[PDB]
Design a protein around this ligand. Sequence first.
Ligand SMILES: CCCCCCCC/C=C\CCCCCCCC(=O)O[C@@H](COC(=O)CCCCCCCCCCCCCCC)COP(=O)([O-])OCC[N+](C)(C)C
Ligand SMILES: CCCCCCCC/C=C\CCCCCCCC(=O)O[C@@H](COC(=O)CCCCCCCCCCCCCCC)COP(=O)([O-])OCC[N+](C)(C)C
Ligand SMILES: CC(C)CCC[C@@H](C)[C@H]1CC[C@H]2[C@@H]3CC=C4C[C@@H](O)CC[C@]4(C)[C@H]3CC[C@]12C
Ligand SMILES: CC(C)CCC[C@@H](C)[C@H]1CC[C@H]2[C@@H]3CC=C4C[C@@H](O)CC[C@]4(C)[C@H]3CC[C@]12C
Lengths: 196, 196
Amino acid sequence: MNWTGLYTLLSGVNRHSTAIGRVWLSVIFIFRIMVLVVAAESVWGDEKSSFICNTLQPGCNSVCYDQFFPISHVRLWSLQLILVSTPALLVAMHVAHQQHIEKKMISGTLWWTYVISVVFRLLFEAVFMYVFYLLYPGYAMVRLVKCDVYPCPNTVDCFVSRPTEKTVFTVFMLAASGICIILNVAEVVYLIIRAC
Amino acid sequence: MNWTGLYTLLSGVNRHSTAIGRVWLSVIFIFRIMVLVVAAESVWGDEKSSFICNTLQPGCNSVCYDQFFPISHVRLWSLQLILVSTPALLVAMHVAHQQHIEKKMISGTLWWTYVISVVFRLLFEAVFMYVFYLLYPGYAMVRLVKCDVYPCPNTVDCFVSRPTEKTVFTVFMLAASGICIILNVAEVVYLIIRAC
Ligand SMILES: CCCCCCCC/C=C\CCCCCCCC(=O)O[C@@H](COC(=O)CCCCCCCCCCCCCCC)COP(=O)([O-])OCC[N+](C)(C)C
Ligand SMILES: CCCCCCCC/C=C\CCCCCCCC(=O)O[C@@H](COC(=O)CCCCCCCCCCCCCCC)COP(=O)([O-])OCC[N+](C)(C)C
Ligand SMILES: CC(C)CCC[C@@H](C)[C@H]1CC[C@H]2[C@@H]3CC=C4C[C@@H](O)CC[C@]4(C)[C@H]3CC[C@]12C
Ligand SMILES: CC(C)CCC[C@@H](C)[C@H]1CC[C@H]2[C@@H]3CC=C4C[C@@H](O)CC[C@]4(C)[C@H]3CC[C@]12C
Protein backbone atom coordinates (compact mmCIF):
# COMPACT_ATOMS: atom_id res chain seq x y z
CA MET A 1 0.00 0.00 0.00
CA ASN A 2 2.25 2.76 -1.32
CA TRP A 3 1.49 6.41 -2.05
CA THR A 4 1.80 6.05 -5.83
CA GLY A 5 -0.91 3.39 -5.87
CA LEU A 6 -3.32 5.45 -3.77
CA TYR A 7 -2.63 8.55 -5.86
CA THR A 8 -3.25 6.63 -9.09
CA LEU A 9 -6.47 5.15 -7.68
CA LEU A 10 -7.78 8.57 -6.63
CA SER A 11 -6.69 10.31 -9.84
CA GLY A 12 -8.62 7.96 -12.12
CA VAL A 13 -5.66 7.81 -14.57
CA ASN A 14 -7.60 10.02 -16.99
CA ARG A 15 -4.42 11.96 -18.03
CA HIS A 16 -6.52 15.14 -18.39
CA SER A 17 -7.01 16.38 -14.80
CA THR A 18 -4.78 19.17 -13.53
CA ALA A 19 -3.37 19.62 -10.03
CA ILE A 20 -6.54 21.28 -8.71
CA GLY A 21 -8.57 18.16 -9.48
CA ARG A 22 -5.96 15.47 -8.91
CA VAL A 23 -4.25 16.73 -5.74
CA TRP A 24 -6.93 18.89 -4.07
CA LEU A 25 -10.31 17.37 -4.98
CA SER A 26 -9.14 13.92 -3.85
CA VAL A 27 -7.96 15.35 -0.52
CA ILE A 28 -11.31 17.08 0.04
CA PHE A 29 -13.10 13.85 -0.85
CA ILE A 30 -11.00 11.95 1.69
CA PHE A 31 -11.72 14.65 4.28
CA ARG A 32 -15.47 14.38 3.67
CA ILE A 33 -15.34 10.58 3.85
CA MET A 34 -13.45 10.67 7.14
CA VAL A 35 -15.73 13.29 8.72
CA LEU A 36 -18.81 11.35 7.61
CA VAL A 37 -17.37 8.14 9.05
CA VAL A 38 -16.51 9.72 12.41
CA ALA A 39 -19.87 11.51 12.68
CA ALA A 40 -22.29 9.05 11.06
CA GLU A 41 -22.93 6.71 13.99
CA SER A 42 -21.55 8.55 17.03
CA VAL A 43 -23.49 11.81 16.62
CA TRP A 44 -26.50 10.89 14.48
CA GLY A 45 -26.71 7.37 15.92
CA ASP A 46 -29.47 8.18 18.42
CA GLU A 47 -31.23 11.00 16.59
CA LYS A 48 -34.49 9.03 16.69
CA SER A 49 -34.41 7.40 20.13
CA SER A 50 -33.04 10.35 22.13
CA PHE A 51 -35.59 12.57 20.37
CA ILE A 52 -38.57 12.99 22.70
CA CYS A 53 -41.59 15.26 22.88
CA ASN A 54 -43.41 16.74 25.88
CA THR A 55 -46.74 15.02 25.19
CA LEU A 56 -48.43 11.82 26.36
CA GLN A 57 -50.13 10.82 23.10
CA PRO A 58 -48.72 7.61 21.58
CA GLY A 59 -47.06 7.95 18.21
CA CYS A 60 -46.41 11.69 18.45
CA ASN A 61 -42.63 11.25 18.70
CA SER A 62 -42.34 9.44 15.36
CA VAL A 63 -44.59 11.82 13.41
CA CYS A 64 -42.81 14.84 14.90
CA TYR A 65 -39.38 13.43 14.04
CA ASP A 66 -40.46 12.69 10.48
CA GLN A 67 -41.98 16.17 10.23
CA PHE A 68 -38.82 17.98 11.32
CA PHE A 69 -36.21 15.60 9.83
CA PRO A 70 -37.48 14.40 6.43
CA ILE A 71 -34.03 12.93 5.76
CA SER A 72 -31.24 13.13 8.31
CA HIS A 73 -28.07 15.08 7.61
CA VAL A 74 -25.80 12.03 7.50
CA ARG A 75 -27.92 10.19 4.94
CA LEU A 76 -28.24 13.35 2.85
CA TRP A 77 -24.46 13.80 2.87
CA SER A 78 -23.95 10.12 2.05
CA LEU A 79 -26.25 10.42 -0.97
CA GLN A 80 -24.46 13.61 -1.99
CA LEU A 81 -21.08 11.87 -1.74
CA ILE A 82 -22.27 8.87 -3.77
CA LEU A 83 -23.79 11.00 -6.52
CA VAL A 84 -20.76 13.32 -6.63
CA SER A 85 -18.41 10.33 -6.88
CA THR A 86 -20.51 8.63 -9.58
CA PRO A 87 -19.15 10.68 -12.54
CA ALA A 88 -15.56 10.09 -11.43
CA LEU A 89 -16.26 6.36 -11.27
CA LEU A 90 -17.84 6.57 -14.73
CA VAL A 91 -14.76 8.29 -16.16
CA ALA A 92 -12.46 5.73 -14.53
CA MET A 93 -14.50 2.87 -15.99
CA HIS A 94 -14.52 4.61 -19.39
CA VAL A 95 -10.74 5.00 -19.47
CA ALA A 96 -10.22 1.42 -18.27
CA HIS A 97 -12.59 0.16 -20.96
CA GLN A 98 -10.78 2.23 -23.59
CA GLN A 99 -7.45 0.75 -22.52
CA HIS A 100 -8.94 -2.75 -22.67
CA ILE A 101 -10.51 -2.22 -26.10
CA GLU A 102 -7.28 -0.80 -27.52
CA LYS A 103 -5.36 -3.69 -25.93
CA LYS A 104 -7.24 -6.28 -28.01
CA MET A 105 -6.37 -4.57 -31.31
CA ILE A 106 -9.49 8.97 -28.73
CA SER A 107 -8.00 11.91 -26.85
CA GLY A 108 -10.76 14.35 -27.79
CA THR A 109 -13.60 12.07 -26.70
CA LEU A 110 -11.88 11.42 -23.36
CA TRP A 111 -11.35 15.16 -22.88
CA TRP A 112 -15.03 15.86 -23.56
CA THR A 113 -16.06 13.01 -21.26
CA TYR A 114 -13.92 14.43 -18.45
CA VAL A 115 -15.30 17.95 -18.96
CA ILE A 116 -18.89 16.66 -18.91
CA SER A 117 -18.08 14.64 -15.79
CA VAL A 118 -16.74 17.70 -13.97
CA VAL A 119 -19.81 19.69 -15.04
CA PHE A 120 -22.13 16.97 -13.73
CA ARG A 121 -20.18 16.77 -10.46
CA LEU A 122 -20.57 20.53 -10.01
CA LEU A 123 -24.27 20.26 -10.84
CA PHE A 124 -24.80 17.50 -8.26
CA GLU A 125 -22.91 19.50 -5.62
CA ALA A 126 -25.07 22.57 -6.28
CA VAL A 127 -28.29 20.54 -6.32
CA PHE A 128 -27.54 18.87 -2.99
CA MET A 129 -26.51 22.17 -1.40
CA TYR A 130 -29.78 23.73 -2.58
CA VAL A 131 -31.76 20.75 -1.25
CA PHE A 132 -30.01 21.11 2.11
CA TYR A 133 -30.93 24.80 2.12
CA LEU A 134 -34.57 23.96 1.33
CA LEU A 135 -34.99 21.26 3.98
CA TYR A 136 -32.94 22.89 6.77
CA PRO A 137 -32.76 26.68 6.42
CA GLY A 138 -29.78 28.03 8.31
CA TYR A 139 -26.65 26.22 9.44
CA ALA A 140 -27.77 25.84 13.07
CA MET A 141 -30.15 23.51 14.88
CA VAL A 142 -32.39 24.41 17.81
CA ARG A 143 -33.20 22.41 20.94
CA LEU A 144 -36.93 23.22 21.00
CA VAL A 145 -39.18 22.48 18.03
CA LYS A 146 -42.90 23.23 18.10
CA CYS A 147 -44.84 20.54 16.24
CA ASP A 148 -48.55 20.60 15.36
CA VAL A 149 -49.28 17.51 13.27
CA TYR A 150 -51.69 14.62 13.70
CA PRO A 151 -52.01 12.84 16.10
CA CYS A 152 -50.21 15.33 18.38
CA PRO A 153 -52.86 17.54 20.04
CA ASN A 154 -52.39 21.29 19.48
CA THR A 155 -48.65 22.15 19.53
CA VAL A 156 -46.12 20.00 21.38
CA ASP A 157 -42.50 20.69 22.36
CA CYS A 158 -40.04 18.20 20.90
CA PHE A 159 -36.38 18.24 21.94
CA VAL A 160 -33.60 17.55 19.45
CA SER A 161 -30.51 15.63 20.60
CA ARG A 162 -27.06 17.23 20.34
CA PRO A 163 -27.98 20.34 18.32
CA THR A 164 -24.57 21.97 18.83
CA GLU A 165 -22.45 19.00 17.75
CA LYS A 166 -24.67 18.52 14.70
CA THR A 167 -24.29 22.24 13.96
CA VAL A 168 -20.50 21.93 14.10
CA PHE A 169 -20.47 18.96 11.74
CA THR A 170 -22.97 20.69 9.44
CA VAL A 171 -20.59 23.66 9.23
CA PHE A 172 -17.68 21.34 8.42
CA MET A 173 -19.57 19.45 5.71
CA LEU A 174 -21.01 22.60 4.13
CA ALA A 175 -17.56 24.20 4.05
CA ALA A 176 -16.16 21.08 2.38
CA SER A 177 -18.98 21.10 -0.17
CA GLY A 178 -18.37 24.77 -0.94
CA ILE A 179 -14.66 24.10 -1.42
CA CYS A 180 -15.57 21.26 -3.79
CA ILE A 181 -17.85 23.57 -5.78
CA ILE A 182 -15.14 26.23 -6.05
CA LEU A 183 -12.53 23.68 -7.11
CA ASN A 184 -14.84 22.19 -9.75
CA VAL A 185 -15.59 25.63 -11.19
CA ALA A 186 -11.87 26.43 -11.25
CA GLU A 187 -11.13 23.12 -13.00
CA VAL A 188 -13.78 23.76 -15.66
CA VAL A 189 -12.48 27.29 -16.26
CA TYR A 190 -8.87 26.11 -16.46
CA LEU A 191 -9.73 23.36 -18.94
CA ILE A 192 -11.70 25.79 -21.12
CA ILE A 193 -8.84 28.30 -21.04
CA ARG A 194 -6.23 25.68 -21.94
CA ALA A 195 -8.42 24.36 -24.77
CA CYS A 196 -8.52 27.83 -26.34
CA MET B 1 -90.70 13.15 65.17
CA ASN B 2 -94.15 14.33 64.10
CA TRP B 3 -95.11 16.55 61.18
CA THR B 4 -96.19 19.47 63.37
CA GLY B 5 -92.74 19.65 64.96
CA LEU B 6 -90.93 19.61 61.62
CA TYR B 7 -93.31 22.20 60.19
CA THR B 8 -92.81 24.47 63.21
CA LEU B 9 -89.03 24.07 62.97
CA LEU B 10 -89.00 24.94 59.26
CA SER B 11 -91.47 27.83 59.63
CA GLY B 12 -89.38 29.68 62.21
CA VAL B 13 -92.54 30.47 64.25
CA ASN B 14 -92.36 34.09 63.08
CA ARG B 15 -96.19 34.36 62.74
CA HIS B 16 -95.73 36.67 59.72
CA SER B 17 -94.90 34.31 56.83
CA THR B 18 -97.68 33.32 54.44
CA ALA B 19 -98.21 29.96 52.74
CA ILE B 20 -95.78 30.77 49.90
CA GLY B 21 -92.92 31.12 52.38
CA ARG B 22 -93.96 28.62 55.03
CA VAL B 23 -95.19 25.71 52.89
CA TRP B 24 -93.31 26.15 49.58
CA LEU B 25 -89.95 27.75 50.45
CA SER B 26 -89.27 25.09 53.09
CA VAL B 27 -90.05 22.33 50.59
CA ILE B 28 -87.69 23.85 48.02
CA PHE B 29 -85.01 24.16 50.71
CA ILE B 30 -85.45 20.48 51.61
CA PHE B 31 -85.27 19.58 47.91
CA ARG B 32 -82.02 21.52 47.48
CA ILE B 33 -80.54 19.95 50.62
CA MET B 34 -81.41 16.44 49.43
CA VAL B 35 -80.08 16.99 45.90
CA LEU B 36 -76.86 18.48 47.29
CA VAL B 37 -76.44 15.53 49.66
CA VAL B 38 -77.01 12.92 46.93
CA ALA B 39 -74.73 14.71 44.44
CA ALA B 40 -71.99 16.17 46.66
CA GLU B 41 -69.76 13.11 47.09
CA SER B 42 -70.95 10.68 44.42
CA VAL B 43 -70.67 12.98 41.39
CA TRP B 44 -68.19 15.68 42.43
CA GLY B 45 -66.23 13.29 44.64
CA ASP B 46 -63.49 12.59 42.08
CA GLU B 47 -63.54 15.86 40.14
CA LYS B 48 -59.85 16.41 40.94
CA SER B 49 -58.41 12.89 40.65
CA SER B 50 -60.32 11.73 37.56
CA PHE B 51 -59.38 15.03 35.90
CA ILE B 52 -56.36 14.45 33.67
CA CYS B 53 -54.58 16.36 30.93
CA ASN B 54 -52.86 15.09 27.78
CA THR B 55 -49.40 16.40 28.72
CA LEU B 56 -46.32 14.95 30.42
CA GLN B 57 -45.24 18.02 32.41
CA PRO B 58 -45.56 17.57 36.19
CA GLY B 59 -48.00 19.85 37.94
CA CYS B 60 -50.03 20.73 34.85
CA ASN B 61 -53.10 18.83 36.07
CA SER B 62 -53.46 20.87 39.26
CA VAL B 63 -52.95 24.27 37.61
CA CYS B 64 -55.38 23.36 34.82
CA TYR B 65 -58.02 22.20 37.28
CA ASP B 66 -57.67 25.37 39.34
CA GLN B 67 -57.81 27.44 36.16
CA PHE B 68 -61.05 25.90 34.90
CA PHE B 69 -62.74 25.23 38.27
CA PRO B 70 -62.01 28.16 40.60
CA ILE B 71 -64.59 26.77 43.03
CA SER B 72 -66.49 23.57 42.35
CA HIS B 73 -70.25 23.59 41.83
CA VAL B 74 -71.03 21.66 45.02
CA ARG B 75 -69.06 24.00 47.27
CA LEU B 76 -70.58 27.03 45.54
CA TRP B 77 -74.08 25.64 46.11
CA SER B 78 -73.24 24.80 49.72
CA LEU B 79 -72.09 28.37 50.34
CA GLN B 80 -75.23 29.65 48.61
CA LEU B 81 -77.42 27.44 50.80
CA ILE B 82 -75.66 28.54 53.99
CA LEU B 83 -75.90 32.24 53.15
CA VAL B 84 -79.53 31.92 52.02
CA SER B 85 -80.45 30.11 55.24
CA THR B 86 -78.58 32.61 57.43
CA PRO B 87 -81.35 35.29 57.47
CA ALA B 88 -83.99 32.68 58.34
CA LEU B 89 -81.80 31.50 61.22
CA LEU B 90 -81.37 35.12 62.32
CA VAL B 91 -85.14 35.68 62.33
CA ALA B 92 -85.71 32.46 64.27
CA MET B 93 -83.12 33.48 66.86
CA HIS B 94 -84.67 36.96 67.04
CA VAL B 95 -88.17 35.64 67.69
CA ALA B 96 -86.87 33.12 70.24
CA HIS B 97 -84.96 35.90 72.01
CA GLN B 98 -88.05 38.11 72.00
CA GLN B 99 -90.12 35.31 73.54
CA HIS B 100 -87.43 34.78 76.18
CA ILE B 101 -87.13 38.48 77.02
CA GLU B 102 -90.91 38.85 77.31
CA LYS B 103 -91.03 35.68 79.43
CA LYS B 104 -88.85 37.25 82.15
CA MET B 105 -91.15 40.27 82.55
CA ILE B 106 -93.23 44.32 69.15
CA SER B 107 -95.25 43.20 66.13
CA GLY B 108 -94.04 45.99 63.85
CA THR B 109 -90.35 45.41 64.54
CA LEU B 110 -90.75 41.67 63.90
CA TRP B 111 -92.62 42.40 60.66
CA TRP B 112 -89.85 44.73 59.48
CA THR B 113 -87.20 42.19 60.50
CA TYR B 114 -88.94 39.47 58.49
CA VAL B 115 -89.30 41.73 55.44
CA ILE B 116 -85.61 42.69 55.60
CA SER B 117 -84.71 39.01 55.99
CA VAL B 118 -86.67 38.05 52.88
CA VAL B 119 -85.05 40.91 50.96
CA PHE B 120 -81.58 39.76 52.03
CA ARG B 121 -82.39 36.16 51.11
CA LEU B 122 -83.47 37.29 47.64
CA LEU B 123 -80.31 39.40 47.34
CA PHE B 124 -78.08 36.45 48.27
CA GLU B 125 -79.89 34.20 45.79
CA ALA B 126 -79.40 36.73 43.00
CA VAL B 127 -75.76 37.34 43.92
CA PHE B 128 -74.90 33.65 43.90
CA MET B 129 -76.75 33.08 40.63
CA TYR B 130 -74.80 35.95 39.07
CA VAL B 131 -71.52 34.57 40.44
CA PHE B 132 -72.35 31.17 38.95
CA TYR B 133 -73.05 32.87 35.62
CA LEU B 134 -69.72 34.71 35.78
CA LEU B 135 -67.60 31.68 36.66
CA TYR B 136 -69.35 29.09 34.46
CA PRO B 137 -71.14 30.68 31.50
CA GLY B 138 -73.84 28.38 30.20
CA TYR B 139 -75.56 25.50 31.95
CA ALA B 140 -73.51 22.77 30.24
CA MET B 141 -70.02 21.37 30.73
CA VAL B 142 -67.68 20.13 28.00
CA ARG B 143 -65.37 17.13 27.98
CA LEU B 144 -62.41 18.89 26.33
CA VAL B 145 -60.88 22.02 27.82
CA LYS B 146 -57.90 23.76 26.21
CA CYS B 147 -55.58 25.13 28.89
CA ASP B 148 -52.56 27.40 28.32
CA VAL B 149 -51.18 28.35 31.74
CA TYR B 150 -47.78 27.93 33.36
CA PRO B 151 -46.17 25.40 33.62
CA CYS B 152 -48.19 23.66 30.88
CA PRO B 153 -46.36 24.14 27.55
CA ASN B 154 -48.43 25.76 24.78
CA THR B 155 -52.06 24.50 24.98
CA VAL B 156 -52.94 21.14 26.53
CA ASP B 157 -56.14 19.10 26.39
CA CYS B 158 -57.65 18.42 29.81
CA PHE B 159 -60.62 16.08 30.20
CA VAL B 160 -63.42 16.79 32.68
CA SER B 161 -65.06 13.88 34.51
CA ARG B 162 -68.81 13.26 34.16
CA PRO B 163 -69.76 16.46 32.29
CA THR B 164 -73.30 15.23 31.53
CA GLU B 165 -74.23 14.20 35.08
CA LYS B 166 -72.85 17.49 36.39
CA THR B 167 -74.87 19.30 33.72
CA VAL B 168 -78.05 17.53 34.87
CA PHE B 169 -77.45 18.43 38.50
CA THR B 170 -76.54 22.00 37.53
CA VAL B 171 -79.88 22.28 35.73
CA PHE B 172 -81.70 20.95 38.79
CA MET B 173 -79.96 23.30 41.22
CA LEU B 174 -80.37 26.35 38.97
CA ALA B 175 -84.08 25.59 38.54
CA ALA B 176 -84.45 25.30 42.31
CA SER B 177 -82.62 28.61 42.81
CA GLY B 178 -84.85 30.31 40.25
CA ILE B 179 -87.95 28.96 41.98
CA CYS B 180 -86.59 30.30 45.28
CA ILE B 181 -86.04 33.74 43.73
CA ILE B 182 -89.56 33.81 42.31
CA LEU B 183 -91.08 32.72 45.63
CA ASN B 184 -89.11 35.35 47.56
CA VAL B 185 -90.22 38.10 45.17
CA ALA B 186 -93.82 36.91 45.48
CA GLU B 187 -93.56 36.89 49.28
CA VAL B 188 -92.17 40.44 49.36
CA VAL B 189 -94.89 41.69 47.00
CA TYR B 190 -97.64 39.96 48.99
CA LEU B 191 -96.38 41.40 52.29
CA ILE B 192 -96.18 44.90 50.80
CA ILE B 193 -99.70 44.59 49.37
CA ARG B 194 -101.15 43.34 52.66
CA ALA B 195 -99.40 46.13 54.58
CA CYS B 196 -101.12 48.74 52.40
C1 LIG C 1 -12.23 5.17 6.01
C2 LIG C 1 -11.71 4.65 7.35
C3 LIG C 1 -10.25 5.03 7.60
C4 LIG C 1 -9.79 4.73 9.02
C5 LIG C 1 -8.45 5.37 9.38
C6 LIG C 1 -7.26 4.71 8.70
C7 LIG C 1 -5.92 5.23 9.22
C8 LIG C 1 -4.72 4.46 8.68
C9 LIG C 1 -4.98 2.99 8.64
C10 LIG C 1 -4.62 2.12 7.69
C11 LIG C 1 -3.86 2.38 6.44
C12 LIG C 1 -2.97 1.20 6.04
C13 LIG C 1 -2.18 0.62 7.21
C14 LIG C 1 -1.23 -0.50 6.79
C15 LIG C 1 -0.27 -0.08 5.69
C16 LIG C 1 0.78 -1.13 5.36
C17 LIG C 1 1.44 -0.84 4.02
C18 LIG C 1 2.55 -1.77 3.65
O1 LIG C 1 3.22 -2.40 4.43
O2 LIG C 1 2.72 -1.80 2.33
C19 LIG C 1 3.64 -2.71 1.72
C20 LIG C 1 3.02 -4.08 1.79
O3 LIG C 1 1.68 -3.98 1.34
C21 LIG C 1 1.01 -5.09 1.05
O4 LIG C 1 1.50 -6.04 0.50
C22 LIG C 1 -0.41 -4.96 1.51
C23 LIG C 1 -0.58 -4.30 2.86
C24 LIG C 1 -2.05 -4.09 3.19
C25 LIG C 1 -2.30 -2.91 4.11
C26 LIG C 1 -3.75 -2.82 4.56
C27 LIG C 1 -4.76 -2.84 3.42
C28 LIG C 1 -6.14 -2.37 3.86
C29 LIG C 1 -6.52 -2.79 5.27
C30 LIG C 1 -8.00 -2.56 5.57
C31 LIG C 1 -8.32 -2.53 7.06
C32 LIG C 1 -9.82 -2.56 7.33
C33 LIG C 1 -10.20 -2.10 8.73
C34 LIG C 1 -9.80 -0.66 9.00
C35 LIG C 1 -10.67 0.03 10.04
C36 LIG C 1 -12.13 0.11 9.62
C37 LIG C 1 3.99 -2.27 0.30
O5 LIG C 1 4.26 -3.42 -0.48
P1 LIG C 1 5.79 -3.92 -0.72
O6 LIG C 1 5.85 -5.41 -0.90
O7 LIG C 1 6.63 -3.23 0.31
O8 LIG C 1 6.04 -3.18 -2.18
C38 LIG C 1 7.09 -3.68 -2.99
C39 LIG C 1 8.42 -3.70 -2.29
N1 LIG C 1 9.45 -2.65 -2.64
C40 LIG C 1 8.77 -1.33 -2.56
C41 LIG C 1 10.59 -2.64 -1.68
C42 LIG C 1 9.96 -2.84 -4.02
C1 LIG D 1 -80.42 14.97 54.85
C2 LIG D 1 -80.36 13.45 54.93
C3 LIG D 1 -81.72 12.79 54.79
C4 LIG D 1 -81.65 11.27 54.63
C5 LIG D 1 -82.96 10.64 54.19
C6 LIG D 1 -84.00 10.55 55.29
C7 LIG D 1 -85.19 9.67 54.92
C8 LIG D 1 -86.09 9.32 56.10
C9 LIG D 1 -85.29 8.92 57.31
C10 LIG D 1 -85.50 9.25 58.58
C11 LIG D 1 -86.61 10.09 59.14
C12 LIG D 1 -87.00 9.65 60.55
C13 LIG D 1 -87.23 8.15 60.68
C14 LIG D 1 -87.70 7.73 62.07
C15 LIG D 1 -88.96 8.46 62.52
C16 LIG D 1 -89.56 7.91 63.80
C17 LIG D 1 -90.60 8.86 64.37
C18 LIG D 1 -91.28 8.38 65.62
O1 LIG D 1 -91.42 7.22 65.93
O2 LIG D 1 -91.73 9.40 66.33
C19 LIG D 1 -92.30 9.21 67.63
C20 LIG D 1 -91.15 8.90 68.57
O3 LIG D 1 -90.15 9.88 68.37
C21 LIG D 1 -89.18 10.00 69.26
O4 LIG D 1 -89.35 9.92 70.45
C22 LIG D 1 -87.87 10.24 68.57
C23 LIG D 1 -87.66 9.40 67.32
C24 LIG D 1 -86.38 9.80 66.61
C25 LIG D 1 -86.42 9.54 65.11
C26 LIG D 1 -85.07 9.80 64.44
C27 LIG D 1 -84.48 11.17 64.76
C28 LIG D 1 -83.33 11.53 63.83
C29 LIG D 1 -82.45 10.35 63.44
C30 LIG D 1 -81.16 10.78 62.74
C31 LIG D 1 -80.51 9.68 61.91
C32 LIG D 1 -79.11 10.05 61.44
C33 LIG D 1 -78.63 9.22 60.26
C34 LIG D 1 -79.52 9.37 59.03
C35 LIG D 1 -78.80 9.08 57.72
C36 LIG D 1 -77.61 10.00 57.48
C37 LIG D 1 -93.12 10.42 68.07
O5 LIG D 1 -93.07 10.53 69.47
P1 LIG D 1 -94.26 9.93 70.40
O6 LIG D 1 -93.75 9.52 71.74
O7 LIG D 1 -95.04 8.98 69.54
O8 LIG D 1 -95.14 11.33 70.56
C38 LIG D 1 -96.05 11.42 71.63
C39 LIG D 1 -97.05 10.28 71.65
N1 LIG D 1 -98.46 10.54 71.20
C40 LIG D 1 -98.38 11.23 69.88
C41 LIG D 1 -99.24 9.28 71.02
C42 LIG D 1 -99.18 11.43 72.16
C1 LIG E 1 -11.38 13.36 -7.95
C2 LIG E 1 -12.01 12.51 -6.85
C3 LIG E 1 -13.48 12.86 -6.69
C4 LIG E 1 -11.80 11.03 -7.15
C5 LIG E 1 -12.44 10.07 -6.15
C6 LIG E 1 -12.41 8.63 -6.64
C7 LIG E 1 -13.58 7.77 -6.13
C8 LIG E 1 -14.88 8.28 -6.73
C9 LIG E 1 -13.33 6.28 -6.40
C10 LIG E 1 -11.83 5.90 -6.26
C11 LIG E 1 -11.78 4.43 -5.81
C12 LIG E 1 -13.23 3.97 -5.88
C13 LIG E 1 -13.61 2.70 -5.15
C14 LIG E 1 -12.77 1.54 -5.65
C15 LIG E 1 -13.36 0.21 -5.33
C16 LIG E 1 -14.57 0.01 -4.81
C17 LIG E 1 -15.02 -1.38 -4.43
C18 LIG E 1 -16.36 -1.73 -5.07
O1 LIG E 1 -16.82 -3.00 -4.66
C19 LIG E 1 -17.38 -0.69 -4.67
C20 LIG E 1 -16.93 0.69 -5.13
C21 LIG E 1 -15.56 1.14 -4.59
C22 LIG E 1 -15.66 1.40 -3.08
C23 LIG E 1 -15.10 2.40 -5.37
C24 LIG E 1 -15.97 3.64 -5.09
C25 LIG E 1 -15.50 4.89 -5.84
C26 LIG E 1 -14.04 5.22 -5.51
C27 LIG E 1 -13.89 5.60 -4.04
C1 LIG F 1 -88.08 29.11 55.01
C2 LIG F 1 -86.88 28.18 55.04
C3 LIG F 1 -85.70 28.82 54.31
C4 LIG F 1 -86.53 27.81 56.48
C5 LIG F 1 -85.25 27.00 56.65
C6 LIG F 1 -84.85 26.85 58.11
C7 LIG F 1 -83.35 26.63 58.33
C8 LIG F 1 -82.60 27.89 57.94
C9 LIG F 1 -83.06 26.18 59.77
C10 LIG F 1 -84.19 25.28 60.34
C11 LIG F 1 -83.53 24.33 61.36
C12 LIG F 1 -82.11 24.85 61.47
C13 LIG F 1 -81.06 23.94 62.09
C14 LIG F 1 -81.48 23.54 63.50
C15 LIG F 1 -80.35 23.03 64.32
C16 LIG F 1 -79.07 23.08 63.98
C17 LIG F 1 -78.02 22.47 64.88
C18 LIG F 1 -76.89 23.45 65.19
O1 LIG F 1 -75.87 22.86 65.97
C19 LIG F 1 -76.29 23.93 63.88
C20 LIG F 1 -77.36 24.62 63.04
C21 LIG F 1 -78.58 23.74 62.70
C22 LIG F 1 -78.17 22.64 61.72
C23 LIG F 1 -79.70 24.65 62.13
C24 LIG F 1 -79.35 25.26 60.77
C25 LIG F 1 -80.46 26.14 60.19
C26 LIG F 1 -81.78 25.37 60.06
C27 LIG F 1 -81.65 24.23 59.04
